[PDB]
Amino acid sequence: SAPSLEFLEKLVIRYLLEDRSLLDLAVGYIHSGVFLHKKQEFDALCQEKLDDPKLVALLLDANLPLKKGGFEKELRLLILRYFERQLKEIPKSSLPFSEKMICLKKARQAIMKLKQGELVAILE
Amino acid sequence: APSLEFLEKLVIRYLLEDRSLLDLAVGYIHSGVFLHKKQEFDALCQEKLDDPKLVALLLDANLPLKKGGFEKELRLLILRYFERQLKEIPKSSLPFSEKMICLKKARQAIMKLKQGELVAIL
């Protein structure tokens, strides 16, 4: 039942399409870089290109079930996924040693908070 | 009251004297936030503790720290960043809709900051 990342990115954007007040919240925590599948859709939604063919198709998709009060749990899972990936990617990266250290600690901390139910921003 | 350059040095000197404060700071700020002390911040993140600018800051005699005073100075540094966005975003090349979103983000950030919250600069 745990969704695919592409499904989760669609879901998150679909909530932002249906209720633009949720975009106001989400831009506190995520940016375009976070998305691995639906970056163009998020970008178009940010520039109110509301007739963009990708965004239209997502707004029209019949298989993305939204629920009252359900947005923040899916935003939190998208962010949690991003930081879980960081935990794998940082040790493989070119970052100076002390920055790998800092960044690993920050990703672990974020994962803790996300699971405590708190939203956490992705800066980098 | 404090110049931006002084606030930046004061923020970095807290981070230099206590690395646990860096752990807190990197939740909210990045080198791009700094206008005057970017090289120093980058040196501290890189643990280049003999960087000559970082050392000048370490040795500065006019940056007394207050116990528990860090978050006040970090919040002011974030507030000033978002106050500048209010001035600079309208003069940018961003398309209108994006200017709107960014400015609303800044106004909302400033409202939280004034209530004592830290807000991330993304």
Side-chain angles (χ1 to χ4, degrees):
Chain A
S1 73
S4 73
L5 184 67
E6 166 164 354
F7 184 84
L8 184 57
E9 290 190 10
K10 282 190 272 197
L11 183 65
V12 165
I13 292 168
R14 180 63 173 267
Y15 271 103
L16 312 182
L17 282 165
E18 293 227 358
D19 185 342
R20 212 165 161 83
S21 77
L22 304 179
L23 180 63
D24 303 345
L25 177 63
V27 300
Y29 299 99
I30 58 164
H31 58 78
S32 174
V34 177
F35 293 90
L36 309 190
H37 301 284
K38 299 291 166 180
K39 178 175 202 302
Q40 301 182 15
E41 290 87 344
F42 184 84
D43 280 342
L45 167 63
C46 280
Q47 327 161 202
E48 262 168 326
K49 301 277 172 57
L50 306 180
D51 298 321
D52 169 290
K54 289 186 191 190
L55 208 59
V56 165
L58 177 56
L59 187 283
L60 267 57
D61 196 329
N63 313 119
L64 299 169
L66 305 183
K67 322 165 220 195
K68 178 187 218 196
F71 176 62
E72 284 186 31
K73 176 201 197 262
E74 308 309 343
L75 177 60
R76 276 198 313 281
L77 183 66
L78 185 70
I79 298 164
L80 176 72
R81 296 197 177 172
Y82 173 88
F83 285 109
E84 284 176 339
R85 289 189 311 276
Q86 286 309 116
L87 276 194
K88 293 191 69 199
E89 294 182 26
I90 288 163
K92 292 164 215 178
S93 78
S94 303
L95 292 165
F97 177 81
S98 54
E99 283 187 19
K100 293 184 161 104
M101 288 191 45
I102 298 167
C103 295
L104 286 168
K105 186 172 202 272
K106 187 237 192 111
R108 285 183 223 285
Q109 185 188 27
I111 290 166
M112 192 179 62
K113 287 167 182 225
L114 290 151
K115 288 164 157 108
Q116 283 161 15
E118 307 193 21
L119 281 166
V120 180
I122 303 169
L123 277 52
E124 61 327 302
Chain B
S3 64
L4 182 63
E5 180 229 77
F6 180 88
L7 178 57
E8 288 183 16
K9 308 190 274 196
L10 182 63
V11 169
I12 297 170
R13 181 63 177 266
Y14 274 104
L15 309 178
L16 215 22
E17 302 294 358
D18 185 347
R19 295 278 194 296
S20 98
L21 302 179
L22 184 60
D23 297 329
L24 171 65
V26 300
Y28 304 98
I29 60 171
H30 54 75
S31 31
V33 186
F34 290 89
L35 296 194
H36 293 107
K37 295 310 172 169
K38 187 186 146 54
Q39 163 178 148
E40 292 86 341
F41 180 80
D42 287 334
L44 179 56
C45 287
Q46 289 173 35
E47 220 59 61
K48 293 195 141 159
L49 298 173
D50 303 310
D51 173 279
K53 299 289 213 29
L54 194 62
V55 178
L57 197 163
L58 174 79
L59 292 187
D60 186 325
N62 291 330
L63 292 176
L65 304 182
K66 297 170 176 151
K67 195 178 160 72
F70 176 63
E71 145 186 298
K72 169 183 192 297
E73 305 303 350
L74 182 66
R75 172 200 305 123
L76 179 63
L77 177 77
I78 302 168
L79 175 57
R80 297 259 268 250
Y81 169 91
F82 284 110
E83 296 271 6
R84 286 193 312 277
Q85 292 279 93
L86 289 182
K87 293 176 176 94
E88 295 172 0
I89 292 290
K91 283 192 266 275
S92 77
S93 75
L94 271 38
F96 188 77
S97 297
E98 302 169 54
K99 286 185 175 99
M100 303 188 51
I101 292 175
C102 301
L103 286 167
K104 166 164 35 191
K105 187 174 170 294
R107 288 199 282 258
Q108 283 180 351
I110 290 172
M111 270 313 105
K112 297 204 7 111
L113 291 154
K114 283 183 182 151
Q115 306 185 82
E117 290 308 293
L118 299 167
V119 170
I121 299 167
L122 283 89

